[PDB]
Nucleic acid binder design. Structure first.
Length: 54
DNA sequence: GATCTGGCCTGTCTTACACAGTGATACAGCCCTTAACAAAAACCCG
């Protein structure tokens, strides 16, 4: 949920207000994503689709 | 003295005889955050 959600919301969250380091940026953003599945499922669905396609 | 040579002189052609090591520059991995979803040999009582 949160992994695919961060890999999806990368553009705006990384080009609007990143933070101190890429580490802390993606950490806080993945936390917010996991605390949003209820609103991030299709990103994980696309991830699993690519995984099956591989 | 003509016509011969072998003696000598050139007159090419063959194989050897060092380019690897130096400072600076440039990229490619390779650890660092969460994070969740899937994955995983190992094994017990089943």
């Amino acid at each position: 949920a949160f992994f695919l959600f961060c890999s999806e919301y990368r553009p705006k969250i990384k080009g609007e207000h990143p933070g101190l380091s890429i580490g802390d940026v993606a950490k806080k953003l993945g936390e917010m994503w996991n605390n949003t599945a209820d609103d991030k499922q299709p990103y994980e669905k696309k991830a699993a689709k690519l995984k099956e396609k591989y």
